[PDB]
Design a protein around this ligand. Sequence first.
Ligand code: S9P
Ligand code: CL
Ligand code: CL
Ligand code: CL
Ligand code: CL
Ligand code: MN
Length: 340
Amino acid sequence: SMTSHSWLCDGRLLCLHDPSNKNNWKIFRECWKQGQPVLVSGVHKKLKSELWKPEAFSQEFGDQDVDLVNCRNCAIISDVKVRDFWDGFEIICKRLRSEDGQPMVLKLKDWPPGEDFRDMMPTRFEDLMENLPLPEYTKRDGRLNLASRLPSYFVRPDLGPKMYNAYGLITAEDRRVGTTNLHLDVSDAVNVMVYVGIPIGEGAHDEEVLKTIDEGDADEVTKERIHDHKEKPGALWHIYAAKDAEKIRELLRKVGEEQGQENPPDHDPIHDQSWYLDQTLRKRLYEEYGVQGWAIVQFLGDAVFIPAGAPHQVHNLYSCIKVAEDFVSPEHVKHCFRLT
Ligand SMILES: Cc1nc2ccc(O)cc2o1
Ligand SMILES: [Cl-]
Ligand SMILES: [Cl-]
Ligand SMILES: [Cl-]
Ligand SMILES: [Cl-]
Ligand SMILES: [Mn+2]
């Protein structure tokens, strides 16, 4: 039976089922006020699927110059064509190779660049913005988005949305690497999975994906969503409450010192965006500091709501196209105030 919602993370994560239900706000606002993330499924069914394919991006924009990142070692690949990224998105035999002769796991950096999504892709912009869930919070002019309404005493978000494009991590060694390292944002955000690419060539690689979700601490109901098939898994997230950010900084200063980094006692390891919390570090955070997070698998068409101030990291299971919009809810406006 169709239902309004369900729970993941053993009751700690709200999952809304109908992205355009006019009564979603009544269930959402209780969880949101408590500083929790929220998941909304089904957004892909609202979108024009032909606008979100890797082959269309390559055909329309392939001659633009861009930089890539090697996710395994953080090396920058400078001033290449955007088709060099898109043509290897699902076909492994077409990827740029490292010195060892392996195909690289790449992230497309800052594309479209800065605030240029709307000018570059006006049809994509309309398709996304008209289909975002919780539209009183998430639209540029929504009644519960204070972004356009605040004076300079508040850090205001850039004009969005922003696109996040990267290959899937593949090997047992790759399990300890992030697509996006641990960081926080002073605005709220909604992140939508608009396409998941499952390759062919080294097709048959779903085996190491199961071990990553399991070791990632995914709850038993998320494992039913994985093991049932039916839906394509994109990325594994770990999100932490804003109230636990300083305890995470204390752990990462202790570990930086143990690993012989030489850092002033005050430096900010979350702002540096240099760490990925692997299974060893997540267990140490729980046991030594008393901090629990939320382990979230974002499937095709899932919208993740990330509260302002909440530290979070992303690990792509397969090749992903994500689109995110920042907003300023009244519940979390304290996180962007410039005094006290
Ligand atoms: C519809 C569908 N195709 C899949 C391929 C791999 C997988 O891990 C889940 C999938 O769900
Ligand atoms: Cl808060
Ligand atoms: Cl467009
Ligand atoms: Cl709403
Ligand atoms: Cl990163
Ligand atoms: Mn973020």
